[PDB]
Design a protein around this ligand. Structure first.
Ligand SMILES: [Cl-]
Length: 298
């Protein structure tokens, strides 16, 4: 049941997470949230739906097509991983294993670049549409006397949604599993001092590293989930007047939707990441037991 897309996302310098799965960019999630956020501001809603269709939908299609072109690269990468995870059943030797691992690095790097291609052009267009949203909300008929009904409704919706899951169970699992993996790594350093290298040892070593890599990605998403949830909850605690000016209202709208979009974008990924760890963990335990047979009779 292997599927690298269950966990493989790419973070960077700024902390942005580019995902290999729909909707790929968090801004796209945000634009979808705004769409039904302003559903009761009638003129703003019709204008937004029109602008969304002209800008966001062709952009998503271009991104989706790019991701689709990366599939052959993804396939080659996953076939390499399959060899590295099951070397004994592949009947591959140590030397060819090391070459395969070398190939894996190149293939992971090549897939990442195929996925992150045009990242800058994509971000620019999302930024351009985001600025366009500000002027679209000028269609909100109130000017200085804007009522905070819609904001309070959506906030209540967001608050109830982030309360539905306890994020602490993800965090504690990742942290606790990470620690046991770090123990495993240290243990294997002692193993290589006592036992001649083989593909089982190499596989344990590889599987431990990619499990740590998955945790790193999972921690990145966990940070976004916590950031999004706490800020949503914070908005509820802060007092707002029954009446605010429109310029304020736009920011209240946008801040709310952005906090939830951030939460939602990473929450979806946090789930499947856990299932991937279970798959790898089961294999790792089997790899450990296989190695025991080697050590025992030597
Ligand atoms: Cl736990």
């Amino acid at each position: 049941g292997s599927d690298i897309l269950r966990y493989l996302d790419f973070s960077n310098s700024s902390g942005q997470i580019i995902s290999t799965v729909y909707p790929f960019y968090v801004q796209m999630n945000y634009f979808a949230e705004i769409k039904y956020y302003i559903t009761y501001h009638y003129e703003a809603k019709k204008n937004y739906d029109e602008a969304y269709n002209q800008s966001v939908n062709p952009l998503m299609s271009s991104i989706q097509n790019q991701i689709n072109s990366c599939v052959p690269k993804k396939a080659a990468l996953e076939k390499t991983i399959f060899v590295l995870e099951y070397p004994e059943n592949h009947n591959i030797n140590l030397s060819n294993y090391e070459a395969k691992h070398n190939e894996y690095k190149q293939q992971l790097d090549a897939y990442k670049n195929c996925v992150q291609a045009n990242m800058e052009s994509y971000t620019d267009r999302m930024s351009k549409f985001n600025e366009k949203i500000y002027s679209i909300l000028n269609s909100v008929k109130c000017t200085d006397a804007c009522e905070t009904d819609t904001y309070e409704i959506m906030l209540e919706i967001y608050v109830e949604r982030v309360k539905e899951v306890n994020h602490n169970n993800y965090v504690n699992y990742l942290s606790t599993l990470k620690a046991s993996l770090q123990l495993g790594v240290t243990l294997m350093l002692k193993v290589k001092q006592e036992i001649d290298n083989n593909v089982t040892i190499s596989a344990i070593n590889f599987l431990q590293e990619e499990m740590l890599d998955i945790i790193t990605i999972g921690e990145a998403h966990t940070g976004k989930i916590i950031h999004g949830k706490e800020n949503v909850l914070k908005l509820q605690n802060n007092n707002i007047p029954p009446q605010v000016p429109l310029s304020t209202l736009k920011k209240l709208y946008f801040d709310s939707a952005n906090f939830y979009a951030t939460y939602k974008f990473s929450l979806k990924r946090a789930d499947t990441t856990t299932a991937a760890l279970k798959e790898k963990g089961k294999l790792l335990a089997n790899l450990y037991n296989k190695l025991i047979t080697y050590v025992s009779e030597k």
